[PDB]
Design a protein around this ligand. Sequence first.
Ligand SMILES: CNCc1ccc2c(c1)c1ccccc1n2CC(F)F
Ligand SMILES: [Zn+2]
Length: 196
Amino acid sequence: SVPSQKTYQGSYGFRLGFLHSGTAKSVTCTYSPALNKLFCQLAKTCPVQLWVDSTPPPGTRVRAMAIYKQSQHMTEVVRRCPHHERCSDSDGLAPPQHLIRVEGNLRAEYLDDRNTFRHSVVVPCEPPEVGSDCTTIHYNYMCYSSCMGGMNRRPILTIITLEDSSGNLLGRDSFEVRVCACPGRDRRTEEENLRK
Ligand SMILES: CNCc1ccc2c(c1)c1ccccc1n2CC(F)F
Ligand SMILES: [Zn+2]
């Protein structure tokens, strides 16, 4: 009824990482460690790093799913709003209803869960390129937090799960997301609010 959001490193030491993009007015994606919250513009690249302490088995996958953060909305499926689901911005692979897309990965698979109706996107877990210490997935969020008839100003969390080839849990991490026109200003505002 509600997916778990419990952080779980598991046997492989799985956890996320984020770049340090700053809060300039021109920034398109920026992560707040103090808030555990990503702020991003609509349909812009969101780099999320995947870190492990040891190599998981061949066939391991990485899934992303959004849920509402507030308990009174958590059973409602997070989906694109009535406008954006109809705006014909398909990449040829993501269903138009899905909020979260993976950019530039032809092996991405999009699931409409037959029992919960929730959306998710899953990719094979690949090792870092030679010379790199982590792997990066590029996500896009395809509606604003404010979209009426969709998220409607309700905060969401993205849950990232490391899964075996059957879909069993190997690791889990999560972060809040706000999709907004000015992520740098909004991060600054929310960090100052938290500090006060
Ligand atoms: C020093 N660098 C460690 C590191 C970090 C991330 C890594 C791996 C190794 C690794 C090895 C095999 C397959 C996937 C791997 N990942 C992606 C996984 F975190 F999602
Ligand atoms: Zn929308």
